[PDB]
């Protein structure tokens, strides 16, 4: 966080409203450019996400990358997403990192696989759903209960209340329904259990 986003004006771990994204366009675009220039940043994100509670402290970088991706998909005029490979892979890898750190439920964490078969506004709405879930729950270490049997912190989304993406999976299921001619075989990744 210090190397990528040093100002840390929004250092609080919980996620703010999506209307705040336009207030910090410069900082989030700087974070996105830093990510684009250095592919090693994603690797360190995954290394941090290996420890469950550590990815909560990356919530600023996660929100900045999510906002940059959301803005690019807002500005993406292409009928598909294959014309922007870096942004598509950044969204996929950001979703993978967040789900790996157990900041997202598995039902809402399998969403990055269907990113490549979607037009920019579907993946934009999906990343907005990710932002909304991380607003409702928030990447906070206190939600992680240290399981002494194995020695690893465990994020129990069932105990959080609506942690399986109650209203957040509605957008994903609507996207699946709209593009059912291409997303039919991927319906097994977004089931409730």
């Amino acid at each position: 966080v210090e190397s990528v986003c040093p100002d840390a004006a929004g250092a609080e771990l919980a996620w703010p409203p999506e209307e705040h994204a336009r207030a910090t366009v410069e900082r989030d675009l700087r974070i996105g450019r830093r990510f684009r220039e250095q592919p090693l940043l994603f690797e360190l994100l995954k290394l941090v996400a290996a420890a469950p509670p550590a990815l909560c402290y990356c919530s600023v970088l996660l929100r900045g990358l999510l906002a940059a991706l959301l803005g690019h998909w807002e500005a993406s005029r292409h009928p598909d997403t294959t014309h922007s490979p870096w942004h598509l892979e950044a969204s996929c890898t950001l979703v993978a990192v967040m789900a790996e750190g157990s900041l997202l439920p598995p039902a809402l964490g399998n969403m990055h696989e269907v990113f490549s078969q979607l037009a920019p506004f579907e993946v934009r709405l999906l990343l907005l759903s990710v932002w909304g879930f991380l607003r409702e729950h928030g990447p906070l270490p206190q939600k992680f209960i240290f399981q002494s049997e194995r020695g690893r912190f465990i994020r129990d989304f069932s105990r959080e209340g609506g942690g399986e993406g109650g209203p957040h999976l509605a957008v994903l299921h609507s996207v699946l329904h709209r593009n059912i001619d291409r997303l039919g075989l991927f319906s097994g990744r977004f089931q409730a259990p």
Binding site: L125, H177, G184, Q191
Partner: protein, 236 residues
């Protein structure tokens, strides 16, 4: 080639041989009795010239204009839908009722589809219509099921109409399947029925999306299995 010209003569519609005419006639008729009745009759006549293809009317005409056209069709046909049962009703009235139910279920299914982001009044009217049909979606589903079950008999093939209505029912069940996983079994049954009907008839005529049907079948084969390394991995 205007709204006023079409209302003058009673035979220029044959010389025209359309959706823009539909929206113009409906806007003129709904603007704040004989002229309105004539405009509605002309709109229904030109709408029937398209063989009542719901896809073109849905993609061209908006929600309130199509709702008004179908309400006028029902008013002139029969003039509550659940209790009709489509048993003793005339074939024209029964087909109009089932077409109205099919359009309603398609709109309630299509309303959940994400889309890219006078006008305010139209949006409010569409929202009110969507809420009203939400309050009466079960009645439409029951009417469609009864029509599919009652395959007693212008006049089109019974198999094509049954396939279309059961495809719409399966799409509705798939849309409803997100909240409850038990609804997917009915969706799978309806999709299998419409696939079998389409394979049996083999007639373009009516017209359904083959790719969408294949995607629905693939989704039902994995949601309720009752091949590819993908499906094998998920299943095991």
């Amino acid at each position: 080639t205007c709204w006023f010209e079409f209302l003058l003569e009673e035979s220029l519609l044959e010389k025209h041989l359309p959706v823009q005419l539909i929206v113009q006639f409906l806007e003129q008729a709904s603007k704040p009795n004989k002229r309105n009745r004539i405009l509605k009759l002309l709109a229904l006549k030109v709408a029937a010239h398209l063989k009542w293809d719901l896809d073109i009317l849905e993609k061209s005409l908006s929600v309130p204009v199509l709702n008004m056209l179908l309400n006028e069709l029902l008013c002139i046909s029969k003039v509550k839908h659940v209790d009709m049962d489509l048993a003793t009703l005339p074939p024209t009235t029964a087909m109009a009722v089932l077409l109205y139910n099919r359009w309603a279920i398609r709109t309630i299914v299509q309303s959940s589809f994400p889309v890219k982001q006078q006008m305010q009044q139209e949006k409010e009217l569409t929202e009110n219509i969507l809420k009203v049909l939400k309050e009466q979606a079960a009645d439409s589903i029951l009417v469609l099921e009864a029509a599919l079950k009652l395959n007693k008999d212008l006049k089109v093939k019974t198999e094509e109409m049954q396939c279309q209505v059961c495809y719409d029912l399966g799409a509705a069940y798939f849309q409803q399947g997100s909240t409850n996983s038990a609804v997917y079994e009915n969706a799978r049954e309806k999709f299998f029925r419409t696939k079998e009907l389409i394979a049996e008839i083999g007639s373009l005529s009516c017209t359904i999306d083959e790719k969408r049907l294949a995607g629905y079948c693939q989704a039902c084969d994995v949601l309720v299995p009752s091949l590819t390394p993908y499906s094998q991995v998920h299943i095991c």
